[PDB]
Amino acid sequence: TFSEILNRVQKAVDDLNLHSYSNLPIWVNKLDMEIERILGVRLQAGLRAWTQVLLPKIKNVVHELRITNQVIYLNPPIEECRYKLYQEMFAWKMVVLSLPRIQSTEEEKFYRNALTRMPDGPVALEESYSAVMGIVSEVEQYVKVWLQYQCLWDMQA
Amino acid sequence: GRTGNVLKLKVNFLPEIITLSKEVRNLKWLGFRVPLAIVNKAHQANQLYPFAISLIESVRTYERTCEKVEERNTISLLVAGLKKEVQALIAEGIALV
């Protein structure tokens, strides 16, 4: 929906451009600044909703404990769940940040500045990361004591 | 509505002058003879009226559209070039007697 709105807006801007009006680029720049501010606000809302969801559709990540050659092992390890969570948060961010810019390089091709366009500053970003660092920590904690049982094999009768 | 002194633009032409011409245009054939100075004035006003009325309607339309523009300030920046060319033509014309 965001891409469609941007496409229609860009089509209207191009229609203005072909009519050969006066002083287009500065108007385009100002409207781009406003639209990126609105994008930053919407990104803030989506990111905070995602964060509280962690604490917005989220994929369910699952990993197992197994044993082989009589050693306890994880599949995948806890850092892998960490990296999947980071990837999913990046995809959620990219939902808004991958949007193209409006014009008459890579940064110029599509808008990647909304993080600095943040209405509340990086806090909403940072707390999101915090949830990750929260959850994973708790995970390994619940793992740790349980994993302790493997010691039973390391001692022999 | 505004404390400032507005320098509203007008046209140096009373709309009622053509009215006088019509009186002459009617009285001349009624048999009454009018002073020749009045005849010349009425004839000149009658032949010059189209320019005056076109000018006044044009300036009124321009004022209406420009106030409509400035009502929505988000567009004046785009319209600036057209407003400049209009003001340039106005500047050229105002010098004329």
Partner: peptide
Amino acid sequence: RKLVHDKELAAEDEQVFLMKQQSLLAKQ
């Protein structure tokens, strides 16, 4: 050396232009 757009088209608010031309009419 990526050139940027120069000064944009100005507005030159109607009141100022009208005042200047009122002065010019007064002096002519």
